[PDB]
Structures are given as C-alpha cells and as structure tokens.
Design a protein around this motif. Structure first.
Motif, PDB file in Angstrom:
ATOM      1  N   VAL B 648      -5.977 -40.553  45.955  1.00 34.81           N
ATOM      2  CA  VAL B 648      -4.603 -40.668  46.407  1.00 34.81           C
ATOM      3  C   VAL B 648      -3.647 -39.956  45.446  1.00 34.81           C
ATOM      4  O   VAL B 648      -2.796 -39.177  45.870  1.00 34.81           O
ATOM      5  CB  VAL B 648      -4.192 -42.145  46.571  1.00 34.81           C
ATOM      6  CG1 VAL B 648      -2.703 -42.243  46.901  1.00 34.81           C
ATOM      7  CG2 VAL B 648      -5.015 -42.778  47.695  1.00 34.81           C
ATOM      8  N   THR B 651      -4.259 -36.052  45.552  1.00 37.08           N
ATOM      9  CA  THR B 651      -3.776 -35.469  46.805  1.00 37.08           C
ATOM     10  C   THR B 651      -2.251 -35.428  46.835  1.00 37.08           C
ATOM     11  O   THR B 651      -1.652 -34.402  47.189  1.00 37.08           O
ATOM     12  CB  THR B 651      -4.307 -36.262  48.021  1.00 37.08           C
ATOM     13  OG1 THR B 651      -5.713 -36.018  48.157  1.00 37.08           O
ATOM     14  CG2 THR B 651      -3.587 -35.853  49.308  1.00 37.08           C
ATOM     15  N   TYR B 652      -1.622 -36.536  46.449  1.00 35.77           N
ATOM     16  CA  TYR B 652      -0.168 -36.601  46.426  1.00 35.77           C
ATOM     17  C   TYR B 652       0.413 -35.474  45.581  1.00 35.77           C
ATOM     18  O   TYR B 652       1.359 -34.797  45.989  1.00 35.77           O
ATOM     19  CB  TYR B 652       0.299 -37.945  45.858  1.00 35.77           C
ATOM     20  CG  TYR B 652       1.803 -38.064  45.692  1.00 35.77           C
ATOM     21  CD1 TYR B 652       2.471 -37.414  44.644  1.00 35.77           C
ATOM     22  CD2 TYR B 652       2.563 -38.823  46.587  1.00 35.77           C
ATOM     23  CE1 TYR B 652       3.868 -37.518  44.491  1.00 35.77           C
ATOM     24  CE2 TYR B 652       3.959 -38.939  46.440  1.00 35.77           C
ATOM     25  CZ  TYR B 652       4.600 -38.281  45.388  1.00 35.77           C
ATOM     26  OH  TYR B 652       5.966 -38.401  45.222  1.00 35.77           O
ATOM     27  N   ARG B 655      -0.292 -31.989  47.121  1.00 34.91           N
ATOM     28  CA  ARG B 655       0.613 -31.793  48.245  1.00 34.91           C
ATOM     29  C   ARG B 655       2.028 -31.479  47.777  1.00 34.91           C
ATOM     30  O   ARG B 655       2.760 -30.751  48.446  1.00 34.91           O
ATOM     31  CB  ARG B 655       0.640 -33.035  49.145  1.00 34.91           C
ATOM     32  CG  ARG B 655      -0.625 -33.257  49.969  1.00 34.91           C
ATOM     33  CD  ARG B 655      -0.487 -34.458  50.907  1.00 34.91           C
ATOM     34  NE  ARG B 655      -1.721 -34.694  51.649  1.00 34.91           N
ATOM     35  CZ  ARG B 655      -1.963 -35.768  52.396  1.00 34.91           C
ATOM     36  NH1 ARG B 655      -1.049 -36.719  52.517  1.00 34.91           N
ATOM     37  NH2 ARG B 655      -3.137 -35.906  52.999  1.00 34.91           N
ATOM     38  N   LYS B 656       2.416 -32.026  46.627  1.00 34.57           N
ATOM     39  CA  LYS B 656       3.756 -31.790  46.123  1.00 34.57           C
ATOM     40  C   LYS B 656       3.848 -30.580  45.188  1.00 34.57           C
ATOM     41  O   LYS B 656       4.781 -29.785  45.296  1.00 34.57           O
ATOM     42  CB  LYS B 656       4.272 -33.061  45.431  1.00 34.57           C
ATOM     43  CG  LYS B 656       5.735 -33.025  45.056  1.00 34.57           C
ATOM     44  CD  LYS B 656       6.308 -34.438  44.835  1.00 34.57           C
ATOM     45  CE  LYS B 656       6.916 -35.011  46.111  1.00 34.57           C
ATOM     46  NZ  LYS B 656       7.629 -36.316  45.880  1.00 34.57           N
TER      47      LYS B 656
END
Lengths: 669, 669
Positions: B648, B651-652, B655-656
C-alpha cells in the motif's frame, strides 16, 4: 402531536373552496373499508369542515361519495369495466343533473383505499372535482419498503432518529405512530413492508418464533387494514441458531422441514404473511450450494401459503485490476436464470456497486427473462447527504427506470423489466430502504419527506415526471403560494446534481470517509478489500472497465449500451471514470479537461448550495417558523460541509495532478 | 491454571543448581512482609524444592535468608548505611566462615519486597549468590501503570482481551488474578496504578462514591500488600454528574468543597490512596480557567491526605500550515510554569503527537523547572502493531530517556528530568499504558510480556541496557538455552526498527487506518481535523516545522537540538519528514533519495519480518508447543500484514511520485 403529518396535512380550505356532501356510502364493512372511511372522514372534516353521515345504501337525493367495488355497483359503467388490476380503481363524478355524486370504484378493497387517497390528494391540491373521470392501475405489483431497523432501537444507516418499531429488544408499546406511518405509506400506494434489518442479529432472528410472533402479528394487523403486506428479514442460519439443528444446508432434509414448519407457524399468526426478505454466518455457499438452491428451499416452505422469497443479490485485491466488483452480481446470478422457483424474486440494487451518488444501471436488469426481479433503491441517504445535505432522489430513480436495456430491442426500459411486462414476471416491482426514524419530522431533513412520497409515486407509476411529483408534494406539505411552490420545487429538482457536483466526479463514486460514509476522504477505501477504487495517480484517474483493455464489464450490457460505454469518445461524461481510466488532460464532451471539470463542479457546487439556502431564506414568513428553521439549520450545515467536500477534493487532485484551476480560485496547498 | 506466570516461572533447577537453606528470618509482620515471605517460599519451593521454616529471630547455626529493615539489624554494615531511598535495599552474603546467610536489608518494607524479587531474579537467572554485595535504589519515585479499562469490560486500545478488573459494570468477583498481577508488577518495581480508563464514562464516574468505594478498597488492599498505591482516573464534571451542583468551575466555592469532601470520603476507605489521574464534558476551560486553576483545585482537596494529582497534558484545519498540533502542549503548559501546587504532576507523552512508531521528544521535558513532570509511554501497541506485530518498545523508550535536552547544558537527559534530579522535583517519574487483558498470556502476543517487564525495569533504572533487560526477560520466561536466548533476544531488539521500516517513513508518523488505527491508509487522517498531516504531493513530502519557513516548532527545543532539526542537512534522517517538507529526490545521510528510502525499508522490512518467523521456527522443540504456536501464529499474521503495509505504501508513493523502485522490485500499479 409528537410528529408531523407530513404530506397528509388536510389544511382547512377557505370559504370559496368547500364541497357539499351529506353522506358517504360505504358498501362494505371490511377492516380496510373501516380505515378508508375513517380517512375520508378525517380529510373532509379537516379540509372542508363537514361531517357527512356514513351509510351503506345510497340516498337518491343526497350529495354523496360512493365507496365500493364492481360487485357493489347497480350499473357497471364502461370505464371501471376495463379495470383488470386488483389494486386499480376508477373515480368519476355522476353526469346526472340531480344530486352531486362521486363514485370511487375499486377492483378490490385495496383499490378503494388508493382511490380515496387519490381523491383526497385532489382536494389538498385544490383540483376541480365537478367532472372527474379517472382510471388508475399501479404498474408494479410489489411497491415495498425495507426497514433496516434493529430491535435495540438503532437503525443501520438511519439518519432520522431511532426506530419507531423497536426499543430495548422489544416492540414499542404504543402503536399510534405505526398507524399514522401506515397511512402515509398507503397514501402513496406502498403495499409491502419488511420491518427489520436485512442484517438479522441475535434477537431479530427470533422474530420468526412464538416469542415475538404475537407482537409481529399485532403490527401486521395494522398494516393489513391499510393494504400493506408484512415481511420479515430472516437469518439463513436460523435452523442452527434457534432450531438446534447441526446445519443450515438448504439440501439437508431436516433443514427443509424446519423451514416448512416455521412457515406454517407464522401463517397461523399472520394468514396473509408476505414472506421473507433474505440477505444470505452459515449460508448456502457455506455448504457449496448456489443461490437457486438456497432460495428455492425457502420458497418451497412458503409456497403452500402464498408467501414470497425476496432474495437480495468482499475480500478482493486492489492490486489486481482484472477483478471487478461491478461484474460480480451479473456473473453470479445470470448463469442461474431459469433455476429459481416462481415465488422467488431477485432483489437487485439500482447500480452494481452500492448506492453511490451516481452509478450506471445494474446489468442484471433485462438479463434474466426467466427470473422475477425487483429493484432496490435507497431512500435513506447513506452516500447522498445523510439527510444533512438535501438530495431529492426522484430524478435519479427516473434515470434508472427509463434506462433502455434493449434486452428485447428498443423499448426495454428497466421499468418494463421490473413491472413484469417485458418478461411476464408473476411477481416483481420495486423496494426502497426506509429513510424514517423517531424524529418528529420523520426523515431527519424535513424536505427528505419528499423522497418517501416520491418513492411511492414512482412505485405506482414510473411514468410520472419528477416535476409533478415535486409539485404534488410541495403543495400538500407547504401550501399553494406560487413562490413557495416554485422555490421548493426548484430546490428539490436541482439538489441531486448539486450534491454530486461537490462529491465524487464523473461516476467513479465513493471518495467518502470509511465506516460512517459521511464526508470527503478521496482515498478512504482506495486500498481496501471492498473493490471500490478510482486508481487516481499523478497522471490520470478512472477504472478501465472496457473489454478492449479493462475488466470487460461493458460486455454485461446489451450491444447498444455496451458500445456506448466501451468507446472513450461516446461514453457519456457523467459516467466516464466508472468505465475508463483517463489522463487528467482528457477532454470531455463539455469541453472541460477531466481535472478542470473536477475543480469546476466542486467550486460551483458550493455556490449552488449557498443559493439553495438563499432561496429558502426568501420564503421566511410564508412557512411556519418551526419548519422554516428546521430546514434552514440543515441548509447551513450543508453549505459548511460542502465547503469541506470542495476543498478536500480540489486539494487532493491539485496535489496529485499538479494542474492549477483555470480560473485561479482558492485551492489550499 | 487459567493464565501464564509470565516471567515468574520459578522453573525447577537440576540437582547441580540447588541452594541449602533451613530458615527464613522475617523480622516484621506487616502485610507487605507476609506477601514477601510468601513469594520467597513460593520461589524456593518451586525452583529449589526446599521449604525453609519461617522464623522471627536468627538461628546462629542455620543457613538462612534474613529479611528486615535497618531498624531490625543487630549490626548496621556500611553498605546498607548509605541507603537514602525509601524503596532501596541491600543484598549481601555473610562473609563469615560459618552458616551461609543472605541478608536482604530494605530502607522500608517496600525495599525488602523489591530486594526479595531481585534475589529471586538472581536465582531464576542462575547467578552465583555465594558472595553477593548488592545495593539498589530506584531512580523514579513514581513507577506507574495506567489502565484504560472500562467497567463494561472493554479496554480502550486493549489488544490482549477484556479487563481483569471489571465486568458488567461491576468489579470481578475473583481477585486471584489481581493478586498474581500485583506480583508481576511488584517484581519489576511498579509502585502505582490507576485502575480505570482516563476517559471516564458514566458508571466509572461513580468509582469515587460509596457505591463503588468498597470494591475499589478491596482491590487497593491487594495492591497495598505488594507496595503499590492505587489511583483513580476522575471525571472533572463529577460535581455536576453525581454531585448535583450546577457547575464544575474549579473556582466555584461549592465545587472546591465538593472535591474536598470527596477526597475525605475516599481516604476513609483507602488511607493511603494515591490520588487522581486527570484527563480534562464540562472542564476548566469550559469556565475560562487554565490548567493550573483546574489542577490546583483538585490538588488542594488531596493535600491534607497526601494524595497526588496526575494532570495529563482537536478541531484544527489541514488548510492552515501555520498551525501545528506538535506545538500545542508546549505552548499551553510552558507559560504555566510555577503556578502549580507541589502535589500536582504534569503527565506528558514521550512525543508531542500521539504515540507514533517514532516521534521526537516532547519539548516540554526540561522546559518547566518549577513544575513536577512525569512521562507517559504506551505499552499497549496502538500504533506499534497492536500485539499482532512484534514490537519490543524498550529501545525506543531508552532513546527518549537518553535524549539530552541540554536544559541546563550537556547532561540534561529526559531521564534526569523525570527522575527529579535535574530540577529537584518532589514528585515525578514515569507511567505506562497497560498492555494486559483477560487473555491467558496476559498481553495478546506472548512476547509482548517483555514490554511490561521492560517498562518496570526502565522505570526502576533507565540506565539498564535494552540488551540486558531482554536477556533477563528471555532467560526467566524461556530458559537458558543459548540458542533460545540469542534468538529471542535478537527478535526483540530488532523488532521495533523492523515494524517502523514497513510503516510510516522518516518520522512523519501516522498513515494508519482511522478509528481502529490498525493497518496502512496513507491518507487516512490526511484531511482530518486532527492535525496529523504528511502533506505528500506529486513532488515531495513532509511537514515544514522549521522557524525559517515553517511552523517554528524547532524553537521549542533548546539551542543545540533546535539547530540540529532546523537544518535540512543536519536533521537526522529518522526524523526528517517530521521537521522538513522535502522533494522525493532529496538525498538522505544514508545516500538514499527520500522516495527510494521509502521503497527500500518497505520491501526490506517485510523480508526482515519473514526472518523473525524463520528464526522462531528454528526454536521448535526448545519451547513448549503451546507458546511455540501461540507466537508462530502471530508471526505469520505479522508477515501477511507487513506485505499489505509494504504494497500500500509503495503503490501510494509510486502513484504520486511517478518514480520507480531503483531495484525493480514489485510495486503494484
């Protein structure tokens, strides 16, 4: 005097809007007829200040309102002669030149009840009844309300107070409010109700036992007099929990017998019991059985008594974009078409996810020609403001009802699917999750009363416009001042779009706080196991549900709609992010980039909310102070929360996209 | 037989590790002395299989263990003569050539209790006691445990079962477990305990009334025999809730009288009542009063009886980066220095936020020379694994205790602040939020027993190394097999860093699911009103707490530490994001970019967790099956959840940031 009459105000008319009637001819003495006569007396006394004598035979020289069924008629006129629906009725003014007579003819007692409420509705609205010629027949056989009330008094997703049915794991002692609630439901044609939460807990599981059946029956007796059948949500593991059996397997001989006995016992208390609403720890799948096997077993237990089984249709990985929660319902039930017993009805939500502000139509509608289906809509505003924010749900429900599935070519709208006409369903219709509670105004937000009223109206006739339903509700609830009518109608009609504007964008849904589901939290469920993802990253957002490159969800619709959503250029803007993953710079049909669209609707949505409040404030003096302030308080709460929605969403996307607002409006870093 | 003995196993020794003793000389008969003698008899019987006769006068020709205070001595030797602390003691083996004698001399009965537990500790650890010469005096006056137990049986932030004190809004009937719990607490020197949640609800508010005082006293009687003073958390609005008074204003004459009477009443039941723990709906600020006014009022009520007031030190906007929750405590209390009564002690958490895996030291320590202070640490793992993930908290607490505040120049470590030496505090020390519950292993995670043990050890002597505390605990709980000792010690000592590696990065904290606080949710509280933000966007992350450009929080530390954190290049990596907002590409002292550091610790942390499990599995056969599997089950749960944390967070940030992992490891899109 503890609660509002809602839309059944029956306000006293001026001297220039009275009616002259000396008698009410009640041709029958059934329990329903006693309630109908009572209602007619209540309305005429309150509105007209008259108290006509109730008689059983017409007085040739008296002005009267005649109540009865075809069987009670001396002469059967052609209009009422075309009635075929049991709940249908005809209302016509006698064309003679003698006494004034209004005939309310119902195919059955239920028809007379709905006819009398229609007649009263005409009076509240100030319609001229000198030359009436009305024929009405409901489109949906099932026009039901699901309560998520728990026996400890709480209501799951209840935003209007505690339950009016239970308290301290017992039924409430006073039933006067249940009677008034029945009256409200019947006034809008609602004919079925499940009184307990679909999630049946320990105490509620006992509702199907002798311990509670007496109280359940007393409640059912009240609803019966108002033409409403009573249902109970059941615990599929009951055979174990209260039966002592070692299993709940629907194929276990003893389990099948246990339910048959349970059914028999219930009908001893409630001869016209409607049946069971089912949300199925042990269950069908626990034993490797499918939904048909699980539903048919309960159906067989209720069959000899005429009962129905309402079968309502979670650890997936966000890492796997090939799995799609939106496809689950269809993939699980479609293959079962034709295996269900006739008295089983599959209850499907309007959308394939979970009552989001906007969701495309559940592909299941129109996909199971051999299985009864009924749509479930949520009146309580779980994801639509929780009665804090105003949200008239009627326009949305009409968009769903009018959605053409093309199941059998053009003209296969969802409404024709659930009214049973398209596939000749024996049992079908629509159900709504109750938005009421112990609050004096019943629905938390005074204006949310419009959603309960509107639900019933659409359930009766999906063809009614959002405009006229709002008009009817406003006039009956707040009077006929043209400014009041125009203003409140405008508020209701534009409210849904306003709320959507500052919440989740372009149909992607969610972005709400986890748990209570109230308020902004863009990534609230973004990495959860609930399959509710928007996949927003620094370049774009959206769920690719296309067949070409995504989950293939689009293929669950018939060709016409599949192609519409499948294509990036034809997919309507309002649902774009539910079907495609796109760059923030992608240009919509509106010309806005996806990112600018987000900023636009969020800033502008707050301004629209402020306008809702401003328009209401201008009505001060034309509405009693109590309700004026009850609503103003909520509109102010809405404005303030809308600001939070706006800023959180705008900031989140600025922080991720790095793209500024075209108009340079305030976005906090 | 319903629960484990934890570290007081007193396992039977082999024939080559026995001791010869015929008598136990108990010089006193006080309640504490009866418990101490009992404990000594229990240990010697269980470990040595001997049952020495308890006598009150030494037998010149018998091997014995002498128990008493200076006053009971025939000859006062120099060592015990230097004792000054009431709870201090000396343990020395007689140097004569006749009978073998062990003298345990305590300054007071409490000293003898702790001396006997030290003696037993030496025996469990297999130390040679032929020539002992030990002197021990605790550094902290208050070595307390705070329970967050509710009377309905629940425990706020309790992950080890239900309360062992309450059930169904009443005190439990059987007190045997309370006695064994007292024994455990006393074995590690804990001398104070608050038995109820700091958040005092309706029923708990009554603990200070005659309705519950009898039961409270019965519990206090047990703790008294083990040298433990009993405290109660109180509801500041009690004067209203149960007193009937119209206000709770600490300046209202009647409110002041009400508390004085309440105090008097409590001491009638509990003559040595410790006092009140206070978390202050109505309160001091509700009436425009400050903390000093609110605390002094309660202090004055307890003063005549010797009681103490433990005063523990929320709608801010994420939009305003000028407001900083980390600065609140210091800004609110510093200005009050010198206004507090002597029997008031401010209880401050180790960090300025809320027990995050890593937080810098609360600036309040060393900043209030005129006000008693005691640090609060959380033994229950709210943000440190919730006893699902292993997390030996001792190393972290030592980092806090050894932190030099430079309040009075070099050598002003937090420990000297809370042990009262630096500012001559009359009352001070440390408190820990209990990690126990009804679970048979007391702490949920068998290895979490080490945190309770370790808390006591540090409370007694903050100078003890994490290494020896772990060694003591492992040897007493699992035996002296060198592989078992080395392996479990390694697991404990490296656990905290391992958990931090896959959770929040570089001291920014949080990133946990809201509500239950368990598990990853990077933006969980990112837009909340709790002031817990990381401000991550597409370019960087971190909270600018610098004076130059940020909140100015750095200025709350003394010059030396302020400058260290103020500078981007000197600020230690482990706290970088708590003090500076930096681009993902910023290079740390380790050479890693901030973003690559995030990927590195998260991937590697999971691998380290798998190693914890592998090392434990290699001990199979050297540990009883019950506890072997109890821990393995949790290590497997840890490994699986660590994977969720890793993915998590990675990925966060991918993605950012849009920046890939340097090593190309698996990051889900």
């Amino acid at each position: 005097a503890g609660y509002e009459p809602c839309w059944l105000r029956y306000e006293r008319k001026d001297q220039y809007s009275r009616l002259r009637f000396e008698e009410i001819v009640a041709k029958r003495t059934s329990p329903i007829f006693q309630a109908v006569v009572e209602e007619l007396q209540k309305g005429l006394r309150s509105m007209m200040e008259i108290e006509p004598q109730v008689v059983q035979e017409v007085n040739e020289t008296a002005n009267s309102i005649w109540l009865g069924t075809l069987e009670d008629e001396e002469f059967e006129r052609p209009l009422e002669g075309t009635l075929v629906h049991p709940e249908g009725y005809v209302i016509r003014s006698d064309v003679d030149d003698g006494p004034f007579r209004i005939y309310i003819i119902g195919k059955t007692d239920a028809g007379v009840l709905y006819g009398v409420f229609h007649f009263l509705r005409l009076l509240q609205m100030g319609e001229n009844i000198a030359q009436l010629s009305i024929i009405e027949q409901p489109k949906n056989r099932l026009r039901m309300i699901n309560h998520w009330d728990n026996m400890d008094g709480s209501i799951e997703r209840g935003y209007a107070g505690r339950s009016i049915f239970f308290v301290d794991d017992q039924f409430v002692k006073q039933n006067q409010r249940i009677k008034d609630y029945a009256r409200l439901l019947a006034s809008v044609g609602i004919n079925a109700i499940s009184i307990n939460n679909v999630n049946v807990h320990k105490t509620e599981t006992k509702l199907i036992t002798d311990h509670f059946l007496p109280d359940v029956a007393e409640v059912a007796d009240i609803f019966r007099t108002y033409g409403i059948k009573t249902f109970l949500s059941i615990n599929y593991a009951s055979p174990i929990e209260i039966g002592g059996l070692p299993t709940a397997d629907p194929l276990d001989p003893e389990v099948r017998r246990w339910w048959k006995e349970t059914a028999k016992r219930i009908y001893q208390y409630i001869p016209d019991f409607g049946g069971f609403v089912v949300k199925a720890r042990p269950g069908p799948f626990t034993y490797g059985r499918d939904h048909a096997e699980g539903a048919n077993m309960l159906a067989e237990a209720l069959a000899p008594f005429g009962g129905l089984v309402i079968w309502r249709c979670c650890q997936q990985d966000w890492r796997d974009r090939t799995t799609d929660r939106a496809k689950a319902a269809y993939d699980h039930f479609k293959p079962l078409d034709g295996q269900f017993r006739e008295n089983v009805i599959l209850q499907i939500k309007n959308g394939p996810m979970d009552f989001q502000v906007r969701e495309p139509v559940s592909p299941l509608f129109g996909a199971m020609p051999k299985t009864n289906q009924m749509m479930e809509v949520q009146i309580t505003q779980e994801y639509t403001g929780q009665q804090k924010h105003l949200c008239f749900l009627i326009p949305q429900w009409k968009e769903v009802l009018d959605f053409d599935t093309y199941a059998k070519g053009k003209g296969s709208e969802v409404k024709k699917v659930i009214d049973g006409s398209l596939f000749d369903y024996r049992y079908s219709g629509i159900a709504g999750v109750s938005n009421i509670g112990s609050d004096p105004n019943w629905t938390g937000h005074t204006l949310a009363q419009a959603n309960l009223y509107g639900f019933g109206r659409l359930a009766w006739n999906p063809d009614l416009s959002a405009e006229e339903i709002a008009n009817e509700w406003v006039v009956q609830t707040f009077g006929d001042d043209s400014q009041v009518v125009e203003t409140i109608s405008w508020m209701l009609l534009s409210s849904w779009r306003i709320y959507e504007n500052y919440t989740s964008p372009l149909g992607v849904g969610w972005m709400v706080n986890p748990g209570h589901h109230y308020g902004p939290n863009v990534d609230g469920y973004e990495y959860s196991h609930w399959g509710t993802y928007h996949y927003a990253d620094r370049d774009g957002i959206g769920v690719d549900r296309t067949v070409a490159t995504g989950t293939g969800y689009t293929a669950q619709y018939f060709p016409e709609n599949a192609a519409m959503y499948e294509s990036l250029d034809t997919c309507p803007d309002e649902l774009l992010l539910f079907f495609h993953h796109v760059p923030y710079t992608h240009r919509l049909h509106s010309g806005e980039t996806v990112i600018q669209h987000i900023y636009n609707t969020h800033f502008e949505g707050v301004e629209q909310a402020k306008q809702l409040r401003k328009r209401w404030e201008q009505l001060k003096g034309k509405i009693d102070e109590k309700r004026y302030h009850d609503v103003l308080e909520r509109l102010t709460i809405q404005v303030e929360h809308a600001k939070e929605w706006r800023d959180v969403i705008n900031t989140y996307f600025y922080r991720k996209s790095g793209i500024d607002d075209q108009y340079g409006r305030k976005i906090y870093r």
